């Protein structure tokens, strides 16, 4: 229909313009917050392909990578009742819920290296944005708040996320290196303005 | 084999860096010339979908658009004997032959505003790169050099080319506005390094 891809195009240039200032981390996050907020304020732009859950696993659909890999934009699609392992990120980020809701559980470790939840579980509603900086709390376990519907969140990461070597942590406290990869081997073409 | 997608990721990055120093047109073109030349020096990187001829029309497969739309990178696929009409561009651009060959005829205008071939036709061989710009010469007709095979060239343009309002030129020298648009509504995912 009127898939409104101009808001994706707008978010992307504006994040990039912002980044062209070499802002310090915390300024960057502060100033991007409203930008992602304006992008998830309404749910009328996300291409269908980039919204399909899987029955076995969550999906990360790559929407855009910056020419200099200063950021990537990803659509995180949880099927009903799905849950990630405990893992870190290693780059700045922002998350904004588009539809459904998700839970975020922060983690820390005992001197042995076993993880344990820390602070309580945050619930993220359609519309809300929280900045992540690894300089604060990098390790977490996230999950679909709902057990019976699809939830989707739009993420922004300060790198090509599917190139970042990060870590997943078992209950027993072993660090497994992982690289997330992407669900889609093709990105949507948000760029064909030959439609008006 | 495995596609050498890192050549493309590298080119994308390097040209954006170059663009970050705000060069003037002649320096941008002198410096970008070698970067594209390296990309089209060996033919081990273009995804197969982005190399597909059409029997009716030449194809324009979008590869990448820069976050701030400072450039875009397009794969231009010619089937046997295809030819464009006479047209302009209104942005700087570099063209780099990947496989096959294309003929280039620049055009100039007489006192009544009617276009005519200006100068000798230029043949573009694999690994060669030519520049174009309103300053340096913008109006031309291009065709596949062969009628017995496919030709591909890699085009870089200082805008989101398929959103740029340009024009084709009638024998009587009048515009007919056009916006090229892209043969592909999905872009290739160059970015999933977790392949290796
Ligand atoms: Cl030249
Ligand atoms: Fe995470
Ligand atoms: Fe042209
Ligand atoms: Na290269
Ligand atoms: Na190829
Ligand atoms: Na000329
Ligand atoms: Na493709």
Short mmCIF file of C-alpha atoms and ligand atoms in Angstrom, two decimals:
data_model
loop_
_atom_site.label_atom_id
_atom_site.label_comp_id
_atom_site.label_asym_id
_atom_site.label_seq_id
_atom_site.Cartn_x
_atom_site.Cartn_y
_atom_site.Cartn_z
CA UNK A 1 0.00 0.00 0.00
CA UNK A 2 1.39 3.41 1.20
CA UNK A 3 4.40 1.65 2.79
CA UNK A 4 5.90 4.78 4.08
CA UNK A 5 9.60 4.28 3.43
CA UNK A 6 10.43 7.99 3.63
CA UNK A 7 10.57 7.79 7.42
CA UNK A 8 13.27 5.13 7.18
CA UNK A 9 15.19 7.24 4.63
CA UNK A 10 14.79 10.31 6.88
CA UNK A 11 15.93 8.51 10.03
CA UNK A 12 19.00 7.23 8.24
CA UNK A 13 20.27 10.56 6.90
CA UNK A 14 19.55 12.25 10.19
CA UNK A 15 21.46 9.68 12.22
CA UNK A 16 24.31 10.09 9.75
CA UNK A 17 24.26 13.92 9.93
CA UNK A 18 24.34 13.67 13.68
CA UNK A 19 27.29 11.24 13.43
CA UNK A 20 29.21 13.54 11.10
CA UNK A 21 29.95 15.78 14.21
CA UNK A 22 32.11 13.16 16.01
CA UNK A 23 29.83 13.55 19.13
CA UNK A 24 30.91 11.82 22.33
CA UNK A 25 28.95 8.64 23.12
CA UNK A 26 26.47 10.05 25.61
CA UNK A 27 25.59 13.07 23.41
CA UNK A 28 25.08 10.78 20.40
CA UNK A 29 22.62 8.62 22.35
CA UNK A 30 20.79 11.58 23.83
CA UNK A 31 20.42 13.15 20.37
CA UNK A 32 19.40 9.94 18.54
CA UNK A 33 16.70 9.02 21.04
CA UNK A 34 14.08 11.37 19.60
CA UNK A 35 15.14 10.29 16.06
CA UNK A 36 14.34 6.58 16.63
CA UNK A 37 11.29 7.73 18.62
CA UNK A 38 9.93 9.56 15.59
CA UNK A 39 10.66 6.40 13.52
CA UNK A 40 8.78 3.94 15.76
CA UNK A 41 6.06 6.44 16.77
CA UNK A 42 3.80 4.70 14.17
CA UNK A 43 3.86 1.24 12.58
CA UNK A 44 3.34 1.94 8.87
CA UNK A 45 6.72 1.61 7.13
CA UNK A 46 8.29 -1.78 7.85
CA UNK A 47 8.39 -3.99 4.73
CA UNK A 48 6.51 -7.24 5.19
CA UNK A 49 9.58 -9.51 4.47
CA UNK A 50 11.27 -7.82 7.41
CA UNK A 51 8.46 -8.71 9.83
CA UNK A 52 8.11 -12.49 9.39
CA UNK A 53 8.75 -14.57 12.50
CA UNK A 54 10.24 -18.11 12.36
CA UNK A 55 8.75 -20.85 14.47
CA UNK A 56 12.23 -22.03 15.72
CA UNK A 57 14.30 -18.85 16.13
CA UNK A 58 14.16 -15.05 16.37
CA UNK A 59 14.93 -13.14 13.15
CA UNK A 60 17.38 -10.20 12.67
CA UNK A 61 16.59 -8.56 9.32
CA UNK A 62 19.25 -6.07 8.23
CA UNK A 63 17.65 -2.88 6.97
CA UNK A 64 20.64 -0.56 6.33
CA UNK A 65 24.38 -0.30 6.88
CA UNK A 66 26.19 3.08 6.83
CA UNK A 67 28.86 3.47 4.13
CA UNK A 68 31.61 3.76 6.79
CA UNK A 69 29.96 1.09 8.97
CA UNK A 70 29.39 3.67 11.67
CA UNK A 71 25.94 2.14 12.24
CA UNK A 72 23.46 -0.50 11.12
CA UNK A 73 19.69 -0.69 11.43
CA UNK A 74 18.04 -4.01 12.18
CA UNK A 75 14.51 -5.28 12.59
CA UNK A 76 14.38 -7.80 15.47
CA UNK A 77 11.43 -10.17 15.02
CA UNK A 78 10.35 -12.43 17.86
CA UNK A 79 7.88 -15.22 17.35
CA UNK A 80 5.63 -16.12 20.32
CA UNK A 81 7.53 -16.75 23.61
CA UNK A 82 11.05 -16.65 22.18
CA UNK A 83 14.11 -15.87 24.30
CA UNK A 84 17.85 -15.08 23.61
CA UNK A 85 20.80 -16.54 25.55
CA UNK A 86 22.73 -14.29 27.86
CA UNK A 87 25.04 -12.22 25.64
CA UNK A 88 26.87 -8.88 25.19
CA UNK A 89 27.07 -6.26 22.38
CA UNK A 90 30.34 -4.18 22.47
CA UNK A 91 28.98 -1.15 20.62
CA UNK A 92 26.55 1.60 21.35
CA UNK A 93 22.90 0.95 20.53
CA UNK A 94 19.34 2.16 20.69
CA UNK A 95 16.20 0.02 20.72
CA UNK A 96 12.68 1.16 19.95
CA UNK A 97 9.61 -1.15 20.12
CA UNK A 98 7.47 -1.16 17.01
CA UNK A 99 4.84 -3.75 17.95
CA UNK A 100 4.30 -6.28 20.74
CA UNK A 101 6.64 -5.82 23.68
CA UNK A 102 9.89 -7.32 24.97
CA UNK A 103 11.69 -7.89 28.28
CA UNK A 104 15.27 -6.92 29.02
CA UNK A 105 17.17 -8.59 31.92
CA UNK A 106 20.57 -7.03 32.82
CA UNK A 107 23.40 -9.44 33.94
CA UNK A 108 26.67 -9.39 35.89
CA UNK A 109 28.94 -12.23 37.10
CA UNK A 110 30.37 -13.90 40.24
CA UNK A 111 34.14 -14.06 40.60
CA UNK A 112 33.98 -17.56 39.09
CA UNK A 113 32.42 -16.25 35.90
CA UNK A 114 28.87 -17.52 36.25
CA UNK A 115 26.22 -15.04 35.18
CA UNK A 116 23.34 -13.89 37.44
CA UNK A 117 20.47 -11.44 36.72
CA UNK A 118 20.91 -8.00 38.11
CA UNK A 119 18.40 -5.17 38.60
CA UNK A 120 14.89 -6.11 37.52
CA UNK A 121 13.30 -6.91 34.19
CA UNK A 122 12.39 -3.90 32.01
CA UNK A 123 9.33 -4.08 29.75
CA UNK A 124 9.43 -2.18 26.49
CA UNK A 125 6.04 -0.99 24.98
CA UNK A 126 5.30 0.12 21.35
CA UNK A 127 6.82 3.61 21.04
CA UNK A 128 9.50 3.50 23.72
CA UNK A 129 13.21 3.93 23.12
CA UNK A 130 16.13 3.12 25.44
CA UNK A 131 19.75 3.81 24.57
CA UNK A 132 22.31 1.09 25.41
CA UNK A 133 25.91 2.05 26.02
CA UNK A 134 28.32 -0.82 26.90
CA UNK A 135 30.14 1.70 29.09
CA UNK A 136 27.22 1.19 31.51
CA UNK A 137 25.66 -2.29 31.27
CA UNK A 138 26.56 -4.43 28.24
CA UNK A 139 25.35 -7.96 29.18
CA UNK A 140 21.68 -8.96 28.94
CA UNK A 141 18.98 -11.55 28.31
CA UNK A 142 15.97 -10.32 26.20
CA UNK A 143 12.72 -12.15 25.31
CA UNK A 144 9.31 -11.70 23.77
CA UNK A 145 7.03 -10.29 26.52
CA UNK A 146 4.05 -12.01 24.91
CA UNK A 147 3.78 -15.81 24.77
CA UNK A 148 1.18 -15.85 21.99
CA UNK A 149 1.98 -13.08 19.44
CA UNK A 150 4.72 -11.54 17.27
CA UNK A 151 6.85 -8.76 18.80
CA UNK A 152 9.17 -6.52 16.79
CA UNK A 153 11.81 -4.03 17.77
CA UNK A 154 13.92 -1.74 15.63
CA UNK A 155 17.61 -1.72 16.71
CA UNK A 156 20.50 0.58 15.84
CA UNK A 157 24.11 -0.52 16.56
CA UNK A 158 27.31 1.40 16.24
CA UNK A 159 28.79 -1.09 13.81
CA UNK A 160 27.86 -3.64 11.15
CA UNK A 161 26.39 -5.83 13.87
CA UNK A 162 26.67 -9.05 11.89
CA UNK A 163 30.42 -8.59 11.74
CA UNK A 164 30.91 -7.97 15.53
CA UNK A 165 32.62 -10.81 17.43
CA UNK A 166 30.79 -10.92 20.75
CA UNK A 167 29.94 -13.40 23.49
CA UNK A 168 27.18 -15.67 24.61
CA UNK A 169 27.39 -16.96 28.27
CA UNK A 170 26.05 -20.31 29.60
CA UNK A 171 24.61 -20.73 33.15
CA UNK A 172 27.85 -22.62 34.05
CA UNK A 173 29.76 -19.48 33.10
CA UNK A 174 31.46 -20.28 29.83
CA UNK A 175 32.00 -17.54 27.26
CA UNK A 176 31.20 -18.67 23.78
CA UNK A 177 32.30 -16.31 20.99
CA UNK A 178 29.57 -15.64 18.44
CA UNK A 179 28.81 -13.51 15.39
CA UNK A 180 25.05 -12.99 14.87
CA UNK A 181 24.69 -13.07 11.09
CA UNK A 182 21.45 -11.87 9.51
CA UNK A 183 18.18 -13.53 8.67
CA UNK A 184 17.91 -12.04 5.18
CA UNK A 185 20.34 -12.57 2.36
CA UNK A 186 18.78 -9.51 0.62
CA UNK A 187 17.83 -6.07 1.98
CA UNK A 188 14.80 -4.16 1.00
CA UNK A 189 15.23 -1.40 -1.63
CA UNK A 190 14.03 1.64 0.24
CA UNK A 191 15.59 3.85 -2.43
CA UNK A 192 13.38 3.69 -5.55
CA UNK A 193 11.65 7.11 -5.43
CA UNK A 194 10.08 6.26 -8.84
CA UNK A 195 6.74 5.60 -7.11
CA UNK A 196 5.30 9.19 -7.39
CA UNK B 1 33.65 -19.77 -5.52
CA UNK B 2 32.96 -17.37 -2.59
CA UNK B 3 32.15 -13.89 -3.82
CA UNK B 4 34.79 -11.40 -2.95
CA UNK B 5 32.23 -9.06 -1.33
CA UNK B 6 34.92 -7.42 0.77
CA UNK B 7 36.21 -5.63 -2.33
CA UNK B 8 32.85 -3.89 -2.48
CA UNK B 9 32.61 -3.25 1.23
CA UNK B 10 36.08 -1.72 0.99
CA UNK B 11 35.28 0.49 -1.95
CA UNK B 12 32.08 1.69 -0.30
CA UNK B 13 34.06 2.64 2.84
CA UNK B 14 36.96 4.26 1.10
CA UNK B 15 34.82 6.48 -1.15
CA UNK B 16 32.82 7.72 1.82
CA UNK B 17 36.10 8.65 3.61
CA UNK B 18 37.20 10.53 0.56
CA UNK B 19 33.82 12.23 0.56
CA UNK B 20 34.34 13.18 4.24
CA UNK B 21 37.14 15.58 3.38
CA UNK B 22 34.73 17.67 1.21
CA UNK B 23 36.93 17.65 -1.86
CA UNK B 24 36.10 19.78 -4.89
CA UNK B 25 34.89 17.98 -8.01
CA UNK B 26 38.19 17.50 -9.82
CA UNK B 27 39.93 16.13 -6.74
CA UNK B 28 37.00 13.81 -5.84
CA UNK B 29 37.21 12.43 -9.37
CA UNK B 30 41.00 12.14 -9.51
CA UNK B 31 40.99 10.24 -6.20
CA UNK B 32 37.94 8.10 -6.75
CA UNK B 33 39.22 7.02 -10.22
CA UNK B 34 41.78 4.62 -8.71
CA UNK B 35 39.38 3.29 -6.04
CA UNK B 36 36.79 2.20 -8.63
CA UNK B 37 39.55 0.87 -10.92
CA UNK B 38 40.62 -1.47 -8.15
CA UNK B 39 37.07 -2.66 -7.67
CA UNK B 40 36.62 -3.55 -11.39
CA UNK B 41 40.18 -4.87 -11.82
CA UNK B 42 39.06 -8.49 -11.26
CA UNK B 43 35.60 -10.03 -11.70
CA UNK B 44 35.18 -12.11 -8.51
CA UNK B 45 32.70 -10.11 -6.46
CA UNK B 46 29.38 -9.27 -8.12
CA UNK B 47 26.36 -11.28 -6.85
CA UNK B 48 24.79 -13.29 -9.66
CA UNK B 49 21.33 -11.72 -9.32
CA UNK B 50 22.96 -8.36 -9.95
CA UNK B 51 24.48 -9.60 -13.17
CA UNK B 52 21.30 -10.69 -14.93
CA UNK B 53 20.44 -9.51 -18.45
CA UNK B 54 16.87 -8.77 -19.48
CA UNK B 55 15.83 -9.59 -23.03
CA UNK B 56 13.81 -6.32 -23.49
CA UNK B 57 15.69 -3.68 -21.47
CA UNK B 58 19.11 -3.01 -19.89
CA UNK B 59 19.02 -3.52 -16.09
CA UNK B 60 20.02 -1.19 -13.29
CA UNK B 61 20.68 -3.13 -10.09
CA UNK B 62 21.20 -1.02 -7.03
CA UNK B 63 24.09 -2.14 -4.84
CA UNK B 64 24.44 0.57 -2.19
CA UNK B 65 23.21 4.01 -1.31
CA UNK B 66 25.15 6.10 1.16
CA UNK B 67 23.31 7.11 4.39
CA UNK B 68 23.29 10.83 3.48
CA UNK B 69 22.73 10.01 -0.22
CA UNK B 70 26.11 11.44 -1.10
CA UNK B 71 26.62 8.61 -3.59
CA UNK B 72 25.15 5.36 -4.85
CA UNK B 73 26.65 2.34 -6.54
CA UNK B 74 24.82 0.59 -9.33
CA UNK B 75 25.45 -2.44 -11.49
CA UNK B 76 24.57 -1.79 -15.07
CA UNK B 77 23.80 -4.92 -17.05
CA UNK B 78 23.55 -4.89 -20.86
CA UNK B 79 22.20 -7.73 -22.98
CA UNK B 80 23.40 -8.16 -26.64
CA UNK B 81 23.05 -4.91 -28.57
CA UNK B 82 21.23 -2.79 -25.98
CA UNK B 83 21.50 1.00 -26.23
CA UNK B 84 20.25 3.94 -24.13
CA UNK B 85 18.72 7.10 -25.55
CA UNK B 86 20.61 10.40 -25.45
CA UNK B 87 20.49 11.68 -21.88
CA UNK B 88 22.27 13.65 -19.20
CA UNK B 89 22.96 13.06 -15.45
CA UNK B 90 23.25 16.30 -13.46
CA UNK B 91 25.67 14.80 -10.93
CA UNK B 92 29.21 13.65 -11.00
CA UNK B 93 29.68 10.00 -11.85
CA UNK B 94 32.32 7.38 -12.56
CA UNK B 95 31.78 4.33 -14.71
CA UNK B 96 34.02 1.24 -14.53
CA UNK B 97 33.81 -1.62 -16.97
CA UNK B 98 33.59 -5.04 -15.35
CA UNK B 99 32.98 -7.45 -18.23
CA UNK B 100 32.32 -6.97 -21.94
CA UNK B 101 32.55 -3.40 -23.25
CA UNK B 102 30.43 -0.33 -23.84
CA UNK B 103 30.49 2.45 -26.45
CA UNK B 104 30.14 6.02 -25.31
CA UNK B 105 29.17 8.90 -27.60
CA UNK B 106 29.24 12.35 -26.01
CA UNK B 107 26.82 14.88 -27.36
CA UNK B 108 26.93 18.69 -27.87
CA UNK B 109 24.29 21.33 -28.82
CA UNK B 110 24.27 23.76 -31.74
CA UNK B 111 22.86 27.32 -31.67
CA UNK B 112 19.23 26.16 -31.86
CA UNK B 113 19.64 23.79 -28.90
CA UNK B 114 19.62 20.59 -31.03
CA UNK B 115 22.04 17.81 -29.84
CA UNK B 116 24.64 16.22 -32.15
CA UNK B 117 27.43 13.76 -31.53
CA UNK B 118 30.37 15.73 -30.22
CA UNK B 119 33.64 14.07 -30.85
CA UNK B 120 34.78 10.49 -31.31
CA UNK B 121 33.02 7.58 -29.69
CA UNK B 122 34.89 6.24 -26.64
CA UNK B 123 35.20 2.43 -26.09
CA UNK B 124 35.37 1.26 -22.48
CA UNK B 125 37.37 -1.90 -21.79
CA UNK B 126 37.33 -4.07 -18.63
CA UNK B 127 39.14 -2.41 -15.73
CA UNK B 128 39.06 1.03 -17.41
CA UNK B 129 37.19 3.94 -15.66
CA UNK B 130 35.82 7.19 -17.16
CA UNK B 131 34.36 10.23 -15.35
CA UNK B 132 31.46 12.44 -16.26
CA UNK B 133 29.94 15.64 -14.81
CA UNK B 134 28.05 18.71 -16.00
CA UNK B 135 31.41 20.55 -15.89
CA UNK B 136 33.37 17.90 -17.77
CA UNK B 137 30.66 16.53 -20.17
CA UNK B 138 27.23 15.11 -19.14
CA UNK B 139 25.30 14.31 -22.33
CA UNK B 140 25.72 11.02 -24.10
CA UNK B 141 24.34 7.87 -25.64
CA UNK B 142 25.73 4.55 -24.43
CA UNK B 143 25.45 1.10 -25.86
CA UNK B 144 26.80 -2.42 -25.27
CA UNK B 145 29.86 -2.75 -27.54
CA UNK B 146 28.82 -6.28 -28.42
CA UNK B 147 25.69 -7.88 -29.84
CA UNK B 148 26.89 -11.39 -28.99
CA UNK B 149 27.24 -11.20 -25.18
CA UNK B 150 26.49 -9.47 -21.87
CA UNK B 151 28.32 -6.42 -20.67
CA UNK B 152 28.43 -5.02 -17.17
CA UNK B 153 29.67 -1.73 -15.87
CA UNK B 154 29.81 -0.41 -12.36
CA UNK B 155 28.47 3.07 -11.96
CA UNK B 156 29.09 5.46 -9.05
CA UNK B 157 27.07 8.70 -8.98
CA UNK B 158 27.11 11.65 -6.63
CA UNK B 159 23.45 11.15 -5.60
CA UNK B 160 20.71 8.47 -5.25
CA UNK B 161 20.73 8.11 -9.02
CA UNK B 162 17.32 6.45 -9.34
CA UNK B 163 15.72 9.46 -7.61
CA UNK B 164 17.45 12.11 -9.63
CA UNK B 165 15.22 14.03 -11.96
CA UNK B 166 17.15 14.10 -15.27
CA UNK B 167 16.13 14.06 -18.91
CA UNK B 168 16.41 12.35 -22.24
CA UNK B 169 16.92 14.51 -25.30
CA UNK B 170 14.72 14.53 -28.36
CA UNK B 171 16.17 15.20 -31.83
CA UNK B 172 14.63 18.78 -31.53
CA UNK B 173 16.55 19.25 -28.29
CA UNK B 174 13.66 19.16 -25.83
CA UNK B 175 13.69 17.46 -22.47
CA UNK B 176 11.50 14.56 -21.58
CA UNK B 177 11.85 14.35 -17.83
CA UNK B 178 12.85 10.91 -16.45
CA UNK B 179 13.80 9.16 -13.27
CA UNK B 180 15.62 5.92 -13.97
CA UNK B 181 14.58 3.81 -10.92
CA UNK B 182 16.07 0.35 -10.25
CA UNK B 183 15.52 -3.15 -11.65
CA UNK B 184 15.65 -4.62 -8.14
CA UNK B 185 13.35 -4.04 -5.20
CA UNK B 186 15.74 -5.93 -2.94
CA UNK B 187 19.44 -5.08 -2.49
CA UNK B 188 22.15 -7.68 -2.02
CA UNK B 189 23.23 -8.25 1.60
CA UNK B 190 27.00 -7.53 1.33
CA UNK B 191 27.12 -7.31 5.09
CA UNK B 192 26.78 -10.81 6.56
CA UNK B 193 30.42 -11.51 7.41
CA UNK B 194 29.43 -14.50 9.61
CA UNK B 195 29.64 -16.52 6.33
CA UNK B 196 33.35 -17.31 6.96
CL1 LIG C 1 38.44 10.28 -17.57
FE1 LIG C 2 21.35 -8.28 23.03
FE1 LIG C 3 24.50 8.25 -19.20
NA1 LIG C 4 38.22 -2.79 -3.95
NA1 LIG C 5 30.19 -12.67 -10.41
NA1 LIG C 6 32.30 17.36 -25.64
NA1 LIG C 7 20.01 -9.25 -5.21
#
